[PDB]
Amino acid sequence: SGFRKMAFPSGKVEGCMVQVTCGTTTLNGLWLDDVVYCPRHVICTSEDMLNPNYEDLLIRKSNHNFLVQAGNVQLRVIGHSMQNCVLKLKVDTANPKTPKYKFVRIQPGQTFSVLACYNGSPSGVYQCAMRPNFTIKGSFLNGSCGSVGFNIDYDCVSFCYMHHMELPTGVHAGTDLEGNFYGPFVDRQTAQAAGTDTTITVNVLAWLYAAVINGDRWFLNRFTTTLNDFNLVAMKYNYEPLTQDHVDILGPLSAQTGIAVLDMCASLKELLQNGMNGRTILGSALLEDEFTPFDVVRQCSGVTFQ
Amino acid sequence: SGFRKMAFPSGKVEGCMVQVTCGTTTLNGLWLDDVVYCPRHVICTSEDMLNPNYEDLLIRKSNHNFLVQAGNVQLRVIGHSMQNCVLKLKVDTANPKTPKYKFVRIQPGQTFSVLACYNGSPSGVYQCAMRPNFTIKGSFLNGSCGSVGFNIDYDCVSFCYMHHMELPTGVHAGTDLEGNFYGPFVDRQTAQAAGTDTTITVNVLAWLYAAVINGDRWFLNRFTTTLNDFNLVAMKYNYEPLTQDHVDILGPLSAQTGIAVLDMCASLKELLQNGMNGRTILGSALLEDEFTPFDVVRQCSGVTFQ
Numbered sequence: 334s335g336f337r338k339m340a341f342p343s344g345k346v347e348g349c350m351v352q353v354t355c356g357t358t359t360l361n362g363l364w365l366d367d368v369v370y371c372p373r374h375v376i377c378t379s380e381d382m383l384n385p386n387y388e389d390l391l392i393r394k395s396n397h398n399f400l401v402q403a404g405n406v407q408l409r410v411i412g413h414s415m416q417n418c419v420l421k422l423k424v425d426t427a428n429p430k431t432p433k434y435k436f437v438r439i440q441p442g443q444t445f446s447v448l449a450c451y452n453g454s455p456s457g458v459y460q461c462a463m464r465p466n467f468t469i470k471g472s473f474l475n476g477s478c479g480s481v482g483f484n485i486d487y488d489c490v491s492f493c494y495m496h497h498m499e500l501p502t503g504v505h506a507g508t509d510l511e512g513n514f515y516g517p518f519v520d521r522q523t524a525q526a527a528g529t530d531t532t533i534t535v536n537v538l539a540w541l542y543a544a545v546i547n548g549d550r551w552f553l554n555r556f557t558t559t560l561n562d563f564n565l566v567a568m569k570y571n572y573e574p575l576t577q578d579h580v581d582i583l584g585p586l587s588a589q590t591g592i593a594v595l596d597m598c599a600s601l602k603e604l605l606q607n608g609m610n611g612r613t614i615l616g617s618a619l620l621e622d623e624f625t626p627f628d629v630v631r632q633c634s635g636v637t638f639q
Numbered sequence: 640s641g642f643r644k645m646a647f648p649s650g651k652v653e654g655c656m657v658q659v660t661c662g663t664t665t666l667n668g669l670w671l672d673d674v675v676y677c678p679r680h681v682i683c684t685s686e687d688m689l690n691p692n693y694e695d696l697l698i699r700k701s702n703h704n705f706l707v708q709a710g711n712v713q714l715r716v717i718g719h720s721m722q723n724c725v726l727k728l729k730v731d732t733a734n735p736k737t738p739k740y741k742f743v744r745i746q747p748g749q750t751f752s753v754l755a756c757y758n759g760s761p762s763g764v765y766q767c768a769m770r771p772n773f774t775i776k777g778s779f780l781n782g783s784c785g786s787v788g789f790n791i792d793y794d795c796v797s798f799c800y801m802h803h804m805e806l807p808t809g810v811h812a813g814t815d816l817e818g819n820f821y822g823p824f825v826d827r828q829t830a831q832a833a834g835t836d837t838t839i840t841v842n843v844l845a846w847l848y849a850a851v852i853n854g855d856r857w858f859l860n861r862f863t864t865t866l867n868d869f870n871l872v873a874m875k876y877n878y879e880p881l882t883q884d885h886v887d888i889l890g891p892l893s894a895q896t897g898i899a900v901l902d903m904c905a906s907l908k909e910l911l912q913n914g915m916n917g918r919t920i921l922g923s924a925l926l927e928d929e930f931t932p933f934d935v936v937r938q939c940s941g942v943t944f945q
């Protein structure tokens with residue numbers, strides 16, 4: 334029992350964190366095999382950041398302009414190339430701690446763990462989700478660039494995020510490990526704004542199923558709804574549209590608890606209308622949207638507390 | 640910017656997790672130097688748990704009755720002894736991944752990271768607090784016994800908790816690493832209940848300072864209070880008493896934000912008496928009490944642990 338915002342154990346990623354320095358700029362790098370991945374803005378001064386020409390800035394660097402430190406050991410950079418917004422530094426040593434890994438680009442609503450780092454050293458681990466507006470509500474200070482997001486399903490680390498910047502609202506923007514930004518963001522200091530954020534409806538429903546699995550049913554009601562009527566109501570509360578894919582994905586949780594997906598949708602419509610009336614759901618007075626259907630199944634028991 | 644429930648990086652602890660099997664019972668063990676620590680109830684069957692005589696049950700066990708698996712390697716048990724509610728299995732091999740460590744017993748209100756494990760394999764990491772009623776609101780399933788709680792203070796892991804059981808309300812009970820339970824709990828399948836819990840006042844104040852540091856200031860007011868008047872009000876809402884030690888500990892945060900601790904206490908008094916009025920603080924509609932003053936300073940200043 335219990336339901337916590339749970340991150341993956343970070344050890345496999347900690348053994349990959351290195352410090353990357355180019356001139357006066359220092360940030361984090363991810364050392365996998367003989368390559369160190371880091372944000373390409375490591376080659377910029379604060380004066381270059383408005384309209385950097387990364388191809389022009391990079392062509393002026395030699396391998397010895399990049400200082401990579403792994404613990405107290407300096408790695409030798411023997412090559413460098415840019416892939417989208419990521420800089421790839423080839424090093425003369427393969428990381429002996431390289432776990433089984435893959436690079437995956439995720440979709441909004443997906444969750445992942447972030448290993449926040451400064452100067453190539455891990456500071457903390459937390460769980461977050463790719464918001465519908467493609468930002469993440471992280472906890473990052475200056476120097477955190479290059480910190481990564483990942484999932485560790487079945488011993489393989491799937492790296493899905495690399496931190497590049499903080500937007501004016503205090504939210505964060507980054508790329509996948511191939512350097513493609515999530516959302517309409519660019520690695521320039523030009524005025525950029527996160528679009529209006531919405532609640533991840535499928536994740537709130539998943540979390541309501543987690544509440545039923547853990548014994549709570551106060552929020553259920555005798556009603557059902559069509560998928561279209563649910564979306565018409567949901568959009569009024571800035572909730573993301575629930576698609577048939579989302580309904581299908583909630584199938585296993587629906588079968589386990591005995592609550593049809595559209596019946597749980599009716600409960601959600603009522604919660605949006607009434608609030609919680611001094612009650613909590615899994616220790617929260619807000620509807621939680623950073624647990625996916627997959628997270629709930631992984632964390633919760635396969636036996637519902639009837 | 641941003642403020643997340645952040646756990647310590649778990650890698651140093653992951654390299655210590657092993658699987659301990661005694662008969663049909665399998666749980667987790669912590670392998671440090673040449674000793675594997677685990678709950679003493681690993682020697683019990685469900686029937687033994689009703690009223691166990693651990694000394695009598697342990698007498699019947701040989702070293703070979705304990706199967707310890709570290710990854711895919713079986714460790715050889717060369718001795719066994721009990722210390723309070725922890726079983727200590729002496730093994731023939733010192734753990735080469737043993738970090739610098741210490742065993743510390745924490746006080747209620749103190750936070751720590753839990754590395755939830757199953758079959759000696761880490762599954763997740765989350766941050767929690769030792770409640771004033773000595774329970775932890777964890778997320779644990781059957782097989783999670785032996786999972787540990789820890790903090791990192793510089794490069795030293797301080798192990799403070801070992802998981803033993805779940806109470807009927809879904810909350811958890813365990814011991815320090817010397818086998819002494821936190822709370823009035825015993826390791827026996829008998830009627831036990833968590834006492835009435837209270838809110839960790841110093842931690843709520845620390846989190847209000849974190850909200851201020853993050854630009855959430857709507858709850859600030861022109862008022863101050865005395866420590867005595869605040870404690871009279873706090874006692875009415877089942878909040879823990881705020882001591883002069885707590886006020887001293889909040890000194891740095893008070894100096895950084897310009898809000899005296901009793902000035903923040905007057906904000907908290909108003910929040911208890913009036914609620915949040917539809918507003919949130921750091922994305923929460925409840926007053927969060929699982930961040931200590933040290934956690935807030937650490938997260939807001941980017942302290943690392945390589």
Ligand SMILES: O=C(Cc1cncc2ccccc12)N(CCC1CCCCC1)Cc1cccs1
Binds near residue numbers: 377474475500519
């Ligand atoms: O937002 C950041 C870093 C950052 C990240 N997370 C959190 C942050 C919090 C506060 C300040 C900064 C943060 N940029 C990088 C700043 C460096 C640029 C090169 C020289 C040295 C500073 C700005 C841009 C990146 C891409 C496009 S604009």
Ligand SMILES: O=C(Cc1cncc2ccccc12)N(CCC1CCCCC1)Cc1cccs1
Binds near residue numbers: 664780829
């Ligand atoms: O509570 C647990 C483990 C546990 C922990 N966390 C979470 C749990 C969730 C569900 C069930 C169990 C959990 N005990 C152990 C159950 C037996 C398993 C087989 C061998 C003998 C013990 C019951 C105890 C009573 C008094 C002290 S322990």
Ligand SMILES: [Cl-]
Binds near residue numbers: 438439440443
């Ligand atoms: Cl995805």
